Structure formats: C-alpha cells, structure tokens
Amino acid sequence: MRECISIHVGQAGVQIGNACWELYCLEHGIQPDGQMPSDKTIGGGDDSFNTFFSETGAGKHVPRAVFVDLEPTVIDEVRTGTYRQLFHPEQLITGKEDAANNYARGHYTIGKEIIDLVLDRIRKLADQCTGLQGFLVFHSFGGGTGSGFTSLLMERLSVDYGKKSKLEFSIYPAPQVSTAVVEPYNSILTTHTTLEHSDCAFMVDNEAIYDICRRNLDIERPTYTNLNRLISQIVSSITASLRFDGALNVDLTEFQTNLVPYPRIHFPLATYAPVISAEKAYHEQLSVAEITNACFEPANQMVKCDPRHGKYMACCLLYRGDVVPKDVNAAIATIKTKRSIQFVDWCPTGFKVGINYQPPTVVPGGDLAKVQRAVCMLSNTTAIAEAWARLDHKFDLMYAKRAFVHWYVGEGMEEGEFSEAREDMAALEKDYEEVGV
Amino acid sequence: MEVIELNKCTSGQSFEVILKPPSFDPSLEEIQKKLEAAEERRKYQEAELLKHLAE
Amino acid sequence: MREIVHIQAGQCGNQIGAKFWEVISDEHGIDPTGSYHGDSDLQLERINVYYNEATGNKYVPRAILVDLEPGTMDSVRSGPFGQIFRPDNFVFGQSGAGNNWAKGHYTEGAELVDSVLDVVRKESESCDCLQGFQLTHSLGGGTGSGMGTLLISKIREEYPDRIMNTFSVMPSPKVSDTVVEPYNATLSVHQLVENTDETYCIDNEALYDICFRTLKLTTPTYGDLNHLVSATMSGVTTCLRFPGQLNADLRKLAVNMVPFPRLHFFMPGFAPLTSRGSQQYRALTVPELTQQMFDSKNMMAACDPRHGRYLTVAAIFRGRMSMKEVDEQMLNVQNKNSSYFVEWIPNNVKTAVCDIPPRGLKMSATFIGNSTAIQELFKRISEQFTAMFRRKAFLHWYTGEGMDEMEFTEAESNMNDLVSEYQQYQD
Amino acid sequence: MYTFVVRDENSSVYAEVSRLLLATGQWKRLRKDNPRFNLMLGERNRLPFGRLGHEPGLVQLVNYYRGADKLCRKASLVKLIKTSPELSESCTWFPESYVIYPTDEREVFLAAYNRGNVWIAKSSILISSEASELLDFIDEVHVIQKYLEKPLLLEPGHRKFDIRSWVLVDHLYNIYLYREGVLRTSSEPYNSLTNHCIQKENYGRYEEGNEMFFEEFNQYLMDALNTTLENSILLQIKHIIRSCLMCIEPAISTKHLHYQSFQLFGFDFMVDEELKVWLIEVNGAPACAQKLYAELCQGIVDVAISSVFPLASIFIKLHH
Ligand SMILES: Nc1nc2c(ncn2[C@@H]2O[C@H](COP(=O)(O)OP(=O)(O)OP(=O)(O)O)[C@@H](O)[C@H]2O)c(=O)[nH]1
Ligand SMILES: Nc1ncnc2c1ncn2[C@@H]1O[C@H](COP(=O)(O)OP(=O)(O)CP(=O)(O)O)[C@@H](O)[C@H]1O
Ligand SMILES: Nc1nc2c(ncn2[C@@H]2O[C@H](COP(=O)(O)OP(=O)(O)O)[C@@H](O)[C@H]2O)c(=O)[nH]1
Ligand SMILES: CCNc1nc2c(c(N3CC(=O)Nc4cc(OC)ccc43)n1)CCC2
C-alpha cells in the first residue's frame, strides 16, 4: 500500500475537495466523526482505502489532505460543516487576504509569505506515510490563489519530493460562472509554470459541467454545489482504482503510463455517463452499450470539443456497477464500426477497462439519481487542444493592449513572463497539431 | 478483438482490448532567487512612490 | 475581516455621507442608537465591513467626519442618525475654506489634517484586516476638494498597499455655488488620477437633469439630488455589505474594472429612478430594469455612453427575481449592442443578484460602468476651466494662499492628458 | 435582431447572402472578430471551429462542415472512396484513380497500365497514353485518374461538357439538390478541359458564356436521344450526391454539437457515350452562374439560415 496526499488550493479546490471527501466517506462507510465500523483493524492497516485515510488509535479515519486558501471564508465552512471532525486543524491553512484574482499576487507577493508553512504541514502528513507515491492537487485556473500559489507549490513539491508523481484536477474558466475578467491571464501563467511539474492533469471546464447540470439535471441556474457534486462523482471514478481492490491504475505512476506517452501532452479528456436527474419520477435504466456509446458524445465530456477531429493516444474505461467484460467488448465492437475513433500510428488501437462492481454512490438529497451502472472514459485525444486555442485567443485579445498588465507588474512580476508563458502555450498547441494531424 | 491481462477479484475485474496494433527542474536556490527578485522590484516601486510623495 | 474605513469631508461629503449611513443602517437593521432590531441574520453576516461592534452589542460606524467649519457637522450630529457616530471621530476646524482649494489643500487644511490621520490610525489599528478607505466629498468646494485630496495623499503615504475609493461629486453650473468650482474640480481631478484606485463620478449635472427631466421636479433641492446619491451608494456597496455568491471586496473590484491605472473613473447608474416620497406600486420587470439600467437617462454622470465604449461593466440586481431571467436580459444587452463593448476585454460584464431589496423598492438595479464616454465630463470641466484661466480670472483667491499659476497650468494639462487617454481606447 | 460576421471577402455566393440578410432588416453585420455572432460566414482556410459554440446565450451557426475537406480535395476523395465500404473499391460511378506522391500506389497503377490506356493526372493536368510521360510531369501531391475517352458529345459542334450541381446540406443534415444545374461546355470539337477559364482563351458560339442550362439540355436529350434529363442522368446524379454525403455524415454531422454547420457544395459530373454519369470532383467553396445567384442565395437564407433563426421550393430533398 502506498499513500496519496490530496492538496486543495483556493476556493474552487477547497469546495470541490469538500464534495470529494464527502463522497469518499459515503463510498467507504466512514461516518462524519471519522469512525468506520467495517474496518476491523483498529488503529492502522494497509488496506486500499488507507491510501487516502490514515487511522488514529481511537479508530478515527483521517483524510490525507491539506486545505490551503489565502482567505479564510471558504475553509472556515469546512471547520464548521458536517465533516469538521474529519480533519485536524493543522491541515486547514488560511491566510488573511486573498490574491484578488491576480496570479502574481498569489505566486509572488502573498505566496512567498506562506509557502514554507504549507510545506511544513504537507511534511507532517508525508511523515505518516510508509511509502508516499505522490499528490493530487485541486485548484482553478482563474483564481489568483488557485493559479498563482498552486504553481509555486508545484515547483517546491518537485524540489522536496523529486521522485513523486503529481496529478492535477484543474477547473478551466467559464465566463458563465466566473467573476474575474483576467482569468485567461492567470490560466496561461499557471499552465506555463506548472507544465513541467505535473505528470497528468484532468481539466474540467465549468461550461461543460454547467450545461450538463442544465440539460440532464433540469437545473435552470446551477450553483457551485450542483457543479461540485457532479465533479466529485467524476473525480471519484478516476481515483476509485487507488482506493479499491483492482489491477488497473493502482498507483499514480500507472496514470502517466496508461494515459500519457508524451510528457507535455498530459491532459486526458474525461467523459461521464449516465447523469440522471433524481427528480425524474420514471427512469429506464441504461445498458452497458448505451453508457459506453455516450462516452463519445461531446455533450457528456468535461471539456466541449470534437474528438472526431483529433487523434487518440490512450483510452481507459472505468465502469462502476453491474458490468461484465463480455458486454463491454460487445459495446466496443459496435461503437468502433459507427464512430470516428482514430489513434495515432505509433499507438495501439485499444481500450484498458476497469470494472468495480459497486455502483456509483450518490449523496443523499443530491441531484443525481442512483443508477445501476456508470462509466468514466479517460481518453488522451488531441481534440482537447481546442480549449487551449480558446484560452490563448482570449489571452491574445487582452494582452495586445496590455490591459490589466499593470496589476501583475505591480506585484513584482515582469512583463516578459506574460509572453514567455504565451510562447510556451504556442509550443503546446503546435505539439498537439503535430500529433493530431 | 483480443482480450488480454484479465484480472478478477471480488470487487470487480480489469482487462485490455486491442482492436489493431500500431501502424508504424529548478533548484530551491533558483526558486528563492526569482521570488526575492520580484520582491525587490516591489520594494523599488514602493520607494519611488514614497520619494514622489516626499517631493 | 475586510474592514472599510469611511471618511466624509466638507459640506457635500458630510451631507451625502450622513444619508449613506442612514440608508445602509436601515438595510442592516441598526437604529439611530446603534442597537440592532432586525429580522434576518443576512443583515449581520458582513456587518463588520462598515460597523464596529461596541459593548452592549451596539454597532458604531467606522466613519470619520471632517470639515473646516462646524456648521454642517453640528447639523449631522443633530440629524436623524447623528448619535450613532463615535463622538471622537468628529474632527473640525473653525475657519472654513471659502470654496478655495488652496485653503483646503495648503493652508487651513494642513493645520487640521494630522488630527484626522490620528483618528484614521485609531480606526485602522482596530481592523482585523483593513481593505482600504472610501471618501465622500465634492470637487467644487474647498474642504472636500482641497483637504479631501490632501487627506488621500497622506493616507496613501501611510497605507500604500490599501485601496482608496472615493465618491466624488462633480460641480455643474446648473447646481453652482461659486464661479471657481472648475478651478477646484480641475485641481482635484489630478489628485484623484494619481491617488485613488476607484472613483465614482457623481455629476451634479446628471442629478439635476434626472430630477428635472425624468422625475418632473421643477425646483430640485440638494435633498432631491442626495436621494439619488444615497440610492446609488447603497447599490454599489451591496456586494460589500451582504453575503452572496460573489462576496466582493474593493481590491477585486479594482483589478477587474480598471485595465489601465489612470482610467478608474466610473459612471454609476440606477433603476428605477424615483423621486423622494413618491411610491412605486408596480415593480419593474427584469427586462425593464436592464433597459433602464443601461439608459443614459439613468446615469449619474452626464455622459452619453453611445459616444464611447464600455471597458468594463458591473451590475447589481436587488430583490426577489429570476436569476435565469437576469442572465438572459444581461446577455441580451451585450449581444444586441456589442459594438459598445470593447472586443479586447472578453466578457467584460459581470452581474450579481442580492435577495434583499432597498427601502421602498421590490426590485432595483445599480450600474457601475467604466466607459470612455466619461471623457465628456472632464472635457466639460476643462472648457469651463480654460474660459476663466485664459484671462487669469479669480486667480488672486489662490495666489493669495501661496499658489502659482504654473500649478494651474500643470493641472490643466494633466486633465487634458486624461481626456486624450480615454480617447485613445475609443479610437 | 440576429447578428453575423463575414470572414471570406472573395466569396461571391455569400457576398450575396450578406446582402439578403441586411435587406431583411433583422440581421446586423458585425466586425470580423466580434465573437458575439449568431452566424459565421467563415474563411476557407483554418476556420476556427474550436472557438464556436462557447458564447453563453448565442445559438451559433457556420457555413462550413468541419471535416468536409476529405470529400473536397482530389487526393482525399480517392482515398475516401477506396477505403469506405459504403463506396468501396468496386465503386461504379467514380473513375479508376490512384494517388501519386512526387501510402502511395505507383505499383498498383502500373499493374493497371500494363493490364485504351489514356489517363489524366491532376491535383488541387496532363493527358497521356504513356505512364512515364505524365508521371515525370508530376515530379516536375497529384492524382492519376482514367481519362474518359468516350464522352457524351453535344450536337451541333461535337462538344464535350461537364455538369455542375449545387448541393446544400443544412444543420439537420438534409441534403438539398438545387433544381437548376449548368453544363459547362467546350466550344472546340472533341479530338481523340471544360473549365470556364480555359474557354475564355470560340467561347460562346453555341450558348451564352459556354453555359447550357437544364431546360435546353433536357430538350436536346428529348429531340436527339429520345429521353429526358431526369431519367438518363439526374437519377445517377442524385444517387452519387446521396452516396458521398451519407458516407461522411458520422464524421462531420453537428447534430449533437455545441455549434451547428451547413455548407454549399459543387458536384462536377461527366456523362459518357451511354448516358452513364461519372463523378469528377466535389467543390467545397463553389461559385454560381450569374443567372442563378439570386435564386440559389435566397434559397440558402430560407433553408439553411432562417430555419435556425426565423424571421417575423427550389430544392430537391434527397431523402435518407
Ligand atoms: N466548479 C467550481 N468552480 C469554482 C468554484 N469556486 C470558484 N470556481 C471557479 O474558479 C474561478 C475563480 O477562482 P477561485 O478558486 O474562486 O479563486 P481563488 O483560487 O480562491 O483565488 P483568489 O480568490 O483570487 O485569491 C472562477 O472561474 C470560478 O468559476 C467551485 O466551487 N466549483
Ligand atoms: N477523368 C476525366 N475524364 C475526362 N475528363 C476529365 C477527367 N477529369 C477531369 N476532366 C476534365 O478536366 C476538367 C478540369 O478538371 P477538374 O474538374 O478536376 O478541375 P477544377 O478543380 O478546376 C473544376 P472545379 O474547381 O470548378 O470543380 C473537367 O472539366 C473535365 O472536363
Ligand atoms: N449633490 C450634492 N452636492 C452638493 C451638496 N452640497 C454641496 N454640493 C456641491 O459641492 C460644491 C460645493 O462644495 P462644498 O462641499 O459645499 O464646500 P466644502 O464644504 O468646502 O467641501 C458645489 O458644486 C455644490 O453643488 C449636496 O448636499 N449634494
Ligand atoms: C464594490 C465592490 N462590489 C462589486 N459588485 C459587483 C461586482 C464586483 N466586482 C468584484 C469581483 O469580484 N468581480 C468583478 C468583475 C468585473 O468584471 C468586469 C466587474 C466587477 C467585479 N464588485 C460585479 C457584479 C456586482
């Protein structure tokens, strides 16, 4: 057993971290006070769920997590919420004033004051690990803290944990729910500085989650609670192999091995199905073929794009529920004949499949209905570069006039980092188009 | 399609399907240096403001 | 946490400042004695932004009252909410400024400015984490214009990393006290260009036109003008005072509204436009709120927004309404008038909704626009300045206080540079 | 109102479409790079499909199908027909073609040459009986195709021609064939290229602008060959258009996409001696005939644009 430490940065990372650990506890039978009756080894053990939970002598199961925000409002709700007993105070870290949607303020000005404290608290969790394998980092692209401080943390983690893997769950900015106009700046700045320090990053576009909540959950104006509960389900599907018995994606290294043959191209596309409204009185349950076919519809992807006009480098299928291999293969055989699935020439055309018999757990009182089978597809397709093209274009529009640049230069950042970061994204888009065409 | 590396446990099973074969960091010093270089650019700009206000 | 220190200087600054504290104390449930008697706890969640909590659970405004003569401040202490203010925070001289920027900035005001900073320091040292300052003042007089900008310069010297925000009332010959108001306003505008992060341009020309043309008030009083000011000030501070999805502060407002440091002068708007006393029996639909909120007749700065382009826009909707209908109507305004929004700032319109409506209105909307059309305001003042300055008329009031003509020439050029900088991004 | 942007200044078809939209009074034109549009008349090269459908509160439509270039380039059309089972290597209405680089199929073409041996070589032109002759011209990507040595010849004149058909595919992937085609004739008697530009280099001895329309051509088929245009030619044309577009529909359809697409195509057909129709190429950005610009462009607004953005039949729907 090898432990994984989760790190949640900024408002988006903290609130999504709240949804994930709430869902983790329900899936493993962990009550809000940390007790887990089904765990017959009191005080320790090397079970698969111990990857995410340590154990005290009194039988409390404590998440291997640290929450950090430069302003206390969001984490204070963790300190007083339903799962307040779950975390000890040392893993909840708050500053006094935030980064004001400014990357340079979170990376340089404020981040320099708090980075050593955060690493010291991360070191406390790592000391409890007999074989730490790496970190899962949750943050947004658009926030000053989620962008600026995360890139500084990722730099120091490579220094202090050189042989450790680091995975991201990143929230791609969408204007429909964002309240900052400079999020293209922060996204490009944080992607450039973090690119060499992240082994695998799962981008989640708020635009896609917002439209999935409107379309399939019949929620007219989805809130962050709506989005994060859905995001937590997809994240749980991705991390289930680290927390349950199995043979696929059993350590963080296997994520890069199975999904990322090119280091810079480490942004797999996540697709999820089925998303069924809990208010739906009468629902006919979907088959293995129908949910597998839904993995190739853009309306179910975490990032809206057209994989038909790209190329696959890897593809995983993560099923939860009543699923047997012969029905997956029958579904893949039909989908291969009807859909445009083109792999790169230097890759085998195939699917790595993982099935967990336990159906997805849904939070009681939530929007998601219980289903008998669900699937999350992780596909490294060059079509995800469409999101880089959108973001870099918005960057180019503002930066051509140097609009808002003075806020970043005023925090000690040099203007050259803007174009240095933009040029790295230009190379990234070129890399995708070389592989995809 | 070839089904390979089938592993079964009580919680589920995993395998791999192949349709077709293929068709063919900065040190701690450097981090601390850039962080302090940005701080001095801040302290310089603050010094110019206080000089401007003194005038 | 996120405390704001309020300062009101001069006659106008104290009259609109007193009305501001009257209105928001009613919205938060604070009575004239500082005791809370409300019904919802949303009134208290962010009450610390503007109020200190004293013994006995009294709520005392974090406000400082400044003037060079006692007249207006004695009437404030006599006013309806005059007893809610900390008596130590009344800082006043005896000589007055005589509508003379030089007296407020260099002679009479310098004697008193250190006493004001002592009260500022006392309030700031009690703040858990000070955001910055908001100042209410006029630009046409002597105290709020001259001493107010001297205060801003010294506050920035002592708190260089804090946000400075002002509600600045622009003079207008339609509502004019003296002929030297263009002199005082031009001198003050340069100070605001250098030493504030955000300035709400509150134009007495627009306030008069709204009262006369829209509200059909034949003889508008300062009470009629301040009814529009207090409704606007309540709206623009809604997201600072009440919890919501946004939870905004002064710094995040400046970062997202100001793409270039000197262009931080905002056009405020409000809907529905109401006269004092007259009641609103039917509430506005969300389409009606959105249409009026962007209408030039609702702007508190006498500028035609169709003569320029919107750099950034912030909108606040207050009341029980469909948030989906707000998004559709706001997206409709941008999608059907896209040429008036600069294309090099994507998605430059942000909207917030607050369930708590202001007093006497079931639904309201407040507009905060950073438009290049604000140059028409500084142009109007520049023309009135030049008309007198080309003959050095009325300068002896200022040279008698030690000022030289060169300082007027510099202030004139500084504001013209500001005008051409706004013209730069309008093309 | 509705808003649209124009990003192809050289398009004669959509320059007229813009006119008709403005004359409606319910369409407003924006600057090229304004993202707040309902309709994009996009550029022909590197159209940014990845930036469409991401504007909140705007249904967005574009006049091009992403991925339709596979059908509209000489090299990729041959590969599409050879490798698609719907069209297959036994396709009876596409001439024997081989892709040749200056995978490649030189050896397969030579096995066809050694096994009338007149071929044509073209790209995005040389007619020779010897493979090395036209091949050395290539190296001096091209496609080598069997030249139809026995074409249908109009009389009087003993003249060769090709048939241009305009096809509109809307956002619902309805296939509309414009009822008016045109024959682009040669004014020189055939001697064992019908491009309009080449003919302006006789020209219009027989018809105005070397263009014979369907009413005259049908009347000729009745007087000369005792048949009609519908029976002898149009059934095959409608079958070929249907087969080509139904083949690539799964690859280019925008049915469940965040943006929508339509596109106007120009199919070029050749009719041989026995009234057998051969597809020559598909043009993805075709122009129209001057007489037909008004009717067709108005039909584009009605069928492809106003169907998505309604306001306050000249097509034959090819069903599938
Ligand atoms: N899905 C999701 N997105 C969020 C959430 N909270 C914020 N965001 C997104 O994150 C972006 C803003 O970043 P934040 O995380 O809120 O800001 P921050 O990281 O705390 O950084 P600062 O507040 O500027 O110091 C916006 O685009 C939001 O849409 C959330 O709870 N769920
Ligand atoms: N296999 C073939 N057999 C006989 N003639 C052929 C032929 N292929 C092409 N041609 C002749 O060559 C002429 C031009 O060829 P082609 O159609 O490929 O060029 P092009 O792309 O300029 C026409 P457009 O662009 O308008 O579709 C055709 O009009 C036809 O008369
Ligand atoms: N809107 C408004 N403007 C005022 C008020 N009182 C004064 N003014 C304006 O302020 C200018 C005079 O400055 P004033 O504040 O009275 O002098 P000060 O005491 O030295 O600051 C003139 O342009 C007046 O029109 C008021 O109550 N409301
Ligand atoms: C006095 C501060 N009250 C405030 N009220 C509102 C907004 C706002 N802010 C701050 C922010 O956090 N985002 C933001 C983005 C933006 O983009 C152009 C414009 C303005 C803001 N502040 C937006 C809606 C109402």
Ligand SMILES: [Ca+2]
């Ligand atoms: Ca145990």
Ligand SMILES: [Mg+2]
């Ligand atoms: Mg934050």
Ligand SMILES: [Mg+2]
């Ligand atoms: Mg006065």
Ligand SMILES: [Mg+2]
């Ligand atoms: Mg062609």
